[PDB]
């Protein structure tokens, strides 16, 4: 039971001077995509390329994953990605993230048949 | 349940959208603030002023509500707001919103004690 005053805040309040600024993207996306449920996921990367292109990475350069497995693949081209990293004073239930827009190659773990991306390992 | 591939799309994929895209603000906010959970709320307004300023409207101009309720008050000044409206192509689970920023006087329905804003009535 959320009070009616808390419901009003949640549904209608977003105090700030540049509410749609690119710096607020991670706070809003981490929330939307359920990565702040019961805890604040510390780091997470969003890829802004088409799914078909990220799926094709599973048939490109095979590399070793961070954990020693060898079912990781690196994209032959760089991709537009956004890195979201918790800000130092971020504490559940007030998760806060810094948004970083870069262009790097991505390394994903591919699984299943057909092979598709199941984990995001690193960007380089 | 959510498959490993689906989980990867939810955590890492945001194709055709960018952090700098201010027209995607309503899509991010309606999702994050839980207004696309089970249905797509048709319309909604976010107020960008401080909460103290919005709380103060309950002691400003008493007016007749425009949307079937009572105890409505209008702000003596205009406020920075964002109107979110479903796009004609919107259908749960794929809600989509059009984002409009404007500055208008807001009308809220107050309740409780102390009297605080419990419903957003209209912008004039």
The DSSP result for chain B, as a single string, is ---HHHHHHHHHB-TT--TT-GGGHHHHHHHHTTSSSSS--SEEEEE-S-HHHHHGGGGSEEE--SSS-S-EEE-SS-EEEEEEEE-TT-BTTB--EEEEEEEE-EEEEEETTTTEEEEEEEE-
Rounded alpha-carbon distances, angstroms, from residue B29 to A118, B3, B6, B63: 27, 26, 22, 29
Contact assessment for residue B106 and residue A8, using Cβ atoms and an 8 Å cutoff: no
A11: three-class secondary structure by DSSP: helix
Backbone angles phi, psi at A41, to 5 degrees: -65, 125
- Beta-sheet strand order (sheet of B61-63): B61-63, B72-74, B106-111, B116-123
Which residues share a beta bridge with A43? A85
Question: In the structure encoding, which two tokens stand for residue B110, read together?
Answer: 């107050």
A86: three-class secondary structure by DSSP: strand
The CATH fold assigned to B1-124 is P-30 Protein (3.10.130)
Chain A residues lying within 8 Å of B117, measured CB to CB: 5, 8, 12
A74: three-class secondary structure by DSSP: strand
- Cα B43 to Cα B16: distance, rounded to the nearest angstrom: 24
Give the residue carrying structure tokens 């130092």.
A88
Residue A9: partners with Cβ closer than 8 Å, 6 or more residues away: B51
B12 has catalytic annotation: yes
- Cα B83 to Cα B123: distance, rounded to the nearest angstrom: 9
Please check whether residue B93 touches A, CB under 8 A.
no
Peptide bond preceding B114 in cis form (omega within 30 of 0): yes
- Cα A108 to Cα A62: distance, rounded to the nearest angstrom: 10
Residue B77: partners with Cβ closer than 8 Å, 6 or more residues away: B105
- Beta-sheet strand order (sheet of B97-104): B43-47, B79-86, B97-104
Give resolution in angstroms.
1.9
Contact assessment for residue B123 and residue B117, using Cβ atoms and an 8 Å cutoff: no
A57: three-class secondary structure by DSSP: helix
- Cα B3 to Cα B85: distance, rounded to the nearest angstrom: 32
Q: Do B48 and A14 touch (CB under 8 A)?
A: yes
Q: What is the 8-class DSSP label of residue A56?
A: G
What are the extents of the domains in chain B? 1-124
Choose the mutation target among B12, B39, B55, B73 for the interface with A, i.e. most A CBs under 10 Å.
B12
- Cα A98 to Cα A85: distance, rounded to the nearest angstrom: 5
Question: In the structure encoding, which two tokens stand for residue B119, read together?
Answer: 């419903």
- Cα A44 to Cα A83: distance, rounded to the nearest angstrom: 6
A33 annotated as a binding-site residue: no
From which experimental method does this structure derive?
X-ray
Contact assessment for residue A102 and residue A90, using Cβ atoms and an 8 Å cutoff: no
- Cα A13 to Cα A7: distance, rounded to the nearest angstrom: 10
Q: Which helix (H) or strand (E) holds A47?
A: strand A43-47
- Cα A53 to Cα A91: distance, rounded to the nearest angstrom: 35
Rounded alpha-carbon distances, angstroms, from residue B61 to B32, B39, B102: 32, 34, 21
């Amino acid at each position: 039971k959320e009070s009616a005053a808390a419901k009003f805040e949640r549904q209608h309040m977003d105090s700030g001077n540049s509410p749609s600024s690119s710096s607020n993207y991670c706070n809003l996306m981490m929330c939307c995509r359920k990565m702040t449920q019961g805890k604040c996921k510390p780091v997470n990367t969003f890829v802004h390329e088409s799914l078909a292109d990220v799926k094709a990475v599973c048939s490109q350069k095979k590399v070793t994953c961070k954990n020693g497995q060898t079912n990781c693949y690196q994209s032959k081209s760089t991709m537009r990605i956004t890195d979201c990293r918790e800000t130092g004073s971020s504490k559940y239930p007030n998760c806060a993230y810094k948004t970083t827009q870069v262009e790097k190659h991505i390394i994903v773990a591919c699984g299943g048949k057909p092979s598709v991306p199941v984990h995001f390992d690193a960007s380089v």
